[PDB]
Every structure is written in structure tokens, then in C-alpha cells.
A paper describes a structure:
[name] [[name]-box helicase 9, also known as [name] A (RHA) or nuclear DNA helicase II (NDH II); EC 3.6.4.13] is a [name]-box [name] which exhibits unwinding activity for both DNA and RNA substrates. [name] is a large, multidomain protein whose RecA domains (RecA1 and RecA2), which are required for helicase activity, are bounded by multiple auxiliary domains; these include two RNA-binding domains (dsRBD1 and dsRBD2) and a minimal transactivation domain (MTAD) N-terminal to the helicase core, and a helicase-associated domain (HA2), an oligonucleotide/oligosaccharide-binding fold (OB) and an RGG box C-terminal to the RecA domains. [name] has been implicated in several biological processes, including regulation of transcription, translation, replication, RNA splicing and processing, and DNA repair. All structures were solved in the presence of the nucleotide reaction product ADP.
Residue numbers in the entry: 270 to 314, 322 to 589, 606 to 1153
The structure:
Amino acid sequence: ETVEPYKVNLSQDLEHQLQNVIQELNLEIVPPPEDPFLPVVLNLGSQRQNQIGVVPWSPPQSNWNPWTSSNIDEGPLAYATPEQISMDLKNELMYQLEQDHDLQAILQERELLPVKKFESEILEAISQNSVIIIRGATGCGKTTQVPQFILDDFIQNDRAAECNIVVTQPRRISAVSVAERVAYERGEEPGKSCGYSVRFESVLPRPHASIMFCTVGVLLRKLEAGIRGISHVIVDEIHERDINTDFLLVVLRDVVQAYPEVRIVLMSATIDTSMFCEYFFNCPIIEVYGRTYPVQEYFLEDCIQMTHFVPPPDANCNLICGDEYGPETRMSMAQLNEKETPFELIEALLKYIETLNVPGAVLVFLPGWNLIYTMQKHLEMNPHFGSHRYQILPLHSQIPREEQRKVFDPVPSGVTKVILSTNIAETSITINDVVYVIDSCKQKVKLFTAHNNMTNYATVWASKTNLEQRKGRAGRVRPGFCFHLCSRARFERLETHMTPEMFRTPLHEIALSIKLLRLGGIGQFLAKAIEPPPLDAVIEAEHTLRELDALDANDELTPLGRILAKLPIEPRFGKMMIMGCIFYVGDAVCTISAATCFPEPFISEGKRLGYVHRNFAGNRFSDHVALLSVFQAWDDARMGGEEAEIRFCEHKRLNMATLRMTWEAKVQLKEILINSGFPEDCLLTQVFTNTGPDNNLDVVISLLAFGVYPNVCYHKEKRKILTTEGRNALIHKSSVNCPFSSQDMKYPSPFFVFGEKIRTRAISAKGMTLVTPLQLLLFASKKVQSDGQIVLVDDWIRLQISHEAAACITALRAAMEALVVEVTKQPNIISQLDPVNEHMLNMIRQISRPSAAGINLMIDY
Ligand SMILES: Nc1ncnc2c1ncn2[C@@H]1O[C@H](COP(=O)(O)OP(=O)(O)O)[C@@H](O)[C@H]1O
Ligand SMILES: [Mg+2]
């Protein structure tokens, strides 16, 4: 079935050098076996424990900026008394209201919002109780108004200086957009009374009488200092059950016991909030409601029948169909695959909607950007859905806020607004003048399985709660309609609620947070959660952090673990960054790491890459080198001003926003290493060639192999690769390593590390970089067994290599790990390392070279 052992052509000069270094370091060499039926394993090999602790809290004061977490000295507000600040801010606001007519008009829109009438009740509830829950339908105005109500209360009652609100949002798009919206509602830009703080981007508001919208991750990273100088904490959209939100509620519950002066406000959609109420000591529930219209529901049976639709040529619920429908309806529906969504039926539904002769927008719920793009392309093919008749606007996370705000804009009468949206438009935002809803009844979820390291962006069935919420979006302006694209049988076999993220998400990052914040045991703390995670996930987290040496045997945070907890990326990439610093390639490795948090900068449109994009790869057969190369080129082109940058990006077909955000992310990652004590000169930008000899890039590739482990694969032919599991898989179309057409690629090595192992119809390897066999042994393997002439790597691939070489390379890995520990104890030692460590690093540098494994990337053969 599987392939023969790969020939590894290693020179004796290098084989000796390896043995000499291992001699010099005096590392324990696992000797060869006597009989070849004895596979010998070449692999080689504290503070006191806590119990529990609470995050400290303190209220706002005048000489303290809670967003920058520092004193105010230089400014005039260092001495300024609270009363002065309060009165000045009040007078400023009063003057603005009487002068600005556009602001008056905006305030008048605010007063018509359903939540307005509950202003008094909400404010009293907050003042009387440490914790409250505000429950109400989506579109009432919980998110935008409640923080303002609270702030304007403190302003207008001459105590503006005692008000600092933190507002948490599950999404990045929400934290930014809400801040922009609230600012506009107060006649400001973000920076004055409102601000935002997400990962790798922030606009901090003023120190006094200010609202800070943020993601939960940002807030948690700041809590090691404490919740210093905050009057209110608003946790929004709790019903979505974001894992970080659920986690925060655990922390906040401990806070309100020890510090009952703080105010917590939980805000929720129309769901059963018993859980949350009971969790927070039977806190009050303030109900919020407004204008609602009855919405007529339809299902796939109904939709097919009234459109007379006919398609092309769990159990299948499209086979099941009641006998109060036509024979054509049964026959037609039975041809539809449930695992697909019927794009042509949606097209038909749009055409049916305009025969009703009632003008209004159509909100179409689709799982991900792919099915939005596919639906969008489908429509614009047909001339009927053109500029004269239709305004088709996509709404997902990965488009500029320029285009996102267009969904709220009105349209000329005669044109119908169609929004192709994700679940963002389910409970988090409310698009206006929506009369019709087409619902796919799907969700998009990350399902990660640790055993095989498989990522699945799975399209899954939504809950009854989801379908009811999506149905509710149609009836805010007038009686609406909702077209569910699931069978009436399927509806019955839907779960009532989605699985919360706490049940199905890796917990290693939350585990690091727990230890950073000194909240006690990982298992102990997560047991107190509203709905605790499964045991295996906790064990998996503990296992992951032990492998990295983030935790010691006592499960206490090591110096290395402290750095990984501070870095807002995957811990494994954090460690790779640290290794990069040791090798003086920290900038490149920080660039690689940053880019994992954002979309691909290449605008490929889901196709194979063209000439321009592939050239960036050089002769390295690497998507990561391509990334680094576009950053080198982009940074050069950016020298000549903003317009020169734009032209470069749209000439090279690059997403300029992605490159900018990634750069800024890199700067902040570097910032945190500097503070942790890493020297400046191991994090400098370093020019590199992607074609010629370059040992700096060699090391990056070696370090990349560590980061993405255990994503390794072996090329057979065309696009077929073998995974770690043993199963076969495809090269992703995006890759520079994907054959452009017929001409097969002559890879100098069959081994590739890669970013994601994606589950779809088949196993796909995305973001692929070629590595040599030596790099495989060094950084892209845990377990290796030698019989004398053949080596077995992680019980999936075999190599024909010297025993001594394999054991020496495995010893280097152990030596490097030992140094990483020593370095994290005292990071500044990389400035001047003793000769023996430099000898170890130099040998790894040599092993990272293509020529080390008898490869020459110059001669394409
Ligand atoms: N960017 C925006 N443009 C136009 N209207 C908006 C925008 N953001 C929010 N709104 C409107 O503000 C109102 C309240 O929305 P929001 O505060 O998000 O409600 P909730 O969180 O209670 O569901 C709604 O009518 C919504 O359409
Ligand atoms: Mg809301």
C-alpha cells in the first residue's frame, strides 16, 4: 500500500560534523540495535502550587487612564478634581445638543428605539443590583443605547468622572462597528467618548466618561493587572455562547462576590436566561420589547411549490414529504441534496417575492463567504439581477467596513436590496426595511479534532432557536415572510439549541489565561463554568501545554509559559517566535505568525494562482516564502506614499488592508518580545532572496516546520499527498505548489509542512512549504525509531539514513529545547551565548540548508 523508504543523500563530511557537535555538547546518544527486529527509540528527555484567586477591582479615579493602564501626569487632568471634569464634560455636551441640528435629528431617531421606554427601569436596576440581565428582541437597541444611557446618567447627574464602561463583544467586526455607530450617535469619531480595542488594532477613548468596546480576549489579557478604574462591565450577546464570553462570566462571578460595588450587565436575546440568572445569584431580568409583526413561515415543500421550481438531475428528509402537496413537489424536492443549498431555488424565490408587489429588502442567510460568493456570482450572471433592479450586498467578516455599512443604506424605489449574510445578521445587527428572509438553515463552525489534527469548516444544521431568530428578522417593519430551505421533516429533527463553544473548542489558550491570571487549577476553574467543558478537552489542553514546556510537572506556569500567555497567538507559534529570536530571524517569524490571524493577502478568487502570484514563491516551493516575499515587496513599494502602495497592490492583485493589518500585528508581537526582554537586534527586518542561497530563510523554514507540526505530508503524484494518519489527501488549489495545469512539478523533496489540514469532501493541505528530510527529523517529528539502516518517523513514513545522523539530529532538537528553556529564564543571553550553544545553533543552521540534503534549488530538476 505505502511507499518504500526515501533515500536521504547525506555527505559523510556533514555526518561527521554532526557527530562532533554531539561529542562537544556531550549529549546522550541512543546506540544502534544489535538485531534489526529491535526498533530503538532515538527520542530523548519547579514552583509550588496554588488553589484559587480572584481578579482585583477598583473604581475610576481622576488621575488614571484605564485604557492605557497608566497614570495621568503630563496633562492638566493630573490634578484636576472630579467635580471640574464632570461639569466641563456636562457643559460641553449641553452646548453640543443646542448647536448641532444633525445631532438633534440623530437623538430623535434614538428616542424612537424600543429600548428607550425602559431607560428609567434599566438605570435603577443597575444602581440597585451588582449584576443584572437585560433581555429583549434583536433590534430594540440594547448594544448601542444601554451604554449611552448609563454614561449620560453619570454625565447629567454631575458625576461624569466616575463613569468608565467596558463593553465586550463576541466578534471583532462588532467591537469596531458598534464603537463607530455609537460615536456617530454622539456626533463624534472614535477617540473621544467611545473607543474600541480588538486584537492588533485599537482606538483608545479619553480617560474620563468613556466607553470601550472590545473583544473578550483583549480584556482578559489586561486582567493580570486587574479591572482597574472601571465602573461598569457590560457583557453583550451572551446567548451566542462565545467560549471566551462564557469564560469571562466565570471570572466576573468571582469578582462580584469579593467586590460588589462593581456593576455587571449581561445582555441577551429572547432565550431562556434561567442559566445565567441562577449563575449570578438570581439577579434581576429586565425585559425589553417593541413593535413586532407576524411572519409567515415556509419550508422547502412550500418554496418549491409556489415557485414551480424543478432542479437538474442522517436519513434524507427530502425523501419524506406529506401527501397534501403535488407529485411534482415530492419528485422535485427528492432530487435536492441536503448537504448542498439550492442556489437556483433562491433565484426563483427572489423572482416570486417581486410578484407580491410589496417593496422591501431580502435578507438571505448563508453559512460562509464561499456560498455567499457562489450565490453572488450566480445572480450577476443573469442580467435580471442588475443595477437597474437589484442591489446585491454581501455581509461577512472579511470585507471592508466601507462595504459593510452599505447594508444599512437605503435604495431608490424600484430597486430591491438583497443581503447575502452570515449569522452576523441573526442577533448582533439589524438591517432595516427587511420584509423577506431566505434561510438556508445552516451554520459554519470550526470543528478541530486533536487526534489527527483535522480542521473542518463544517456546514451544519442550525437550531430551532436559530430558525426562529432568523424568522424574526422579517417582521420589524411590516408583516413579513420567511423561506426556510429545509424540509418540514428536517425541522423536526433539528436540535433546540446549538452546541456551546465550550463543548467543542480547544482550551489551551483559556488554560494559559487561567494560569496567567493566577486563578488556580485549569480543571478546577473550568469546573465552575456555567456549562463546564468535557474532560478530554481539559486533558488535551494540559497535555498540549506540557509538551511545549508552558507548564511544568506541577502544572505551574514556566517562564516560557508566561511569554506564550502574553502573546495573542497560538502557543506553538509563540514558541516558534521565541526560537526565531534565538536564531536572529525574529521579524520573519513574527510575520509568519501574524499572517495566521488574517485572510490570505493574495486575491485569487478561489482559483489556481497566476504568474504574478507564483513568482513571489521563488524556487522554494513555499507559500510561506511567497508571503514573506510579498511583504518585502509591499514594504518597498510603500516607500513612495499611499497612492504608490495602492497601485502596487491592485497591480499585483493584493489585499492592501490585509497587508496593513498583518504588519501592525507583527509590530505588536515584536513589542511584547521586547518587553519580555528580547534584544532589538534579533527582531530587525532582514532583506532576503527567494531564489539564491539564503541561510536566514533556511532557518525560518526549519522553524516553520516546528510551528505547524504535526502537519507533515508526502507527495506521490499530481496533487495526491499522504498525511500523518496514513490516509491520502489533496494539495489545495491556492498553493504555489499546486500544478497550474498539465505540467507536473519536479519537487527536490516529497516532504511538505503546511498550515491547515482541512476536511471537506477530501483532505486538503493549505499553505504548503517544502522541507528537506533533515528538517523533517529535526522539527517536524516527535517519535523516531531506527532498525540500523531504516528509520520510522511517527509510524507513517520511513527514511533510509545513517543511524548516527538521525540520532544526532534528534539530539539537536533536545539541545534546542533545553536552550529555549534557558533563554526564557533570561532572554537577554542571546546577545552573547557561550561557544557550545553557538556550535549547536550553527549546526542546525547547516542542517536547515537545501544543500545539506544534496538539493540545489537553482538548477530546476
Ligand atoms: N451602522 C448602522 N446603521 C444604521 N442603523 C444601525 C446601525 N447600527 C445599528 N443600527 C440600528 O440601531 C438600532 C439598535 O441596534 P442594536 O443596538 O444593535 O440592537 P440590539 O443589540 O438590542 O439588537 C437598530 O434599529 C439598528 O438597525
Ligand atoms: Mg446587541
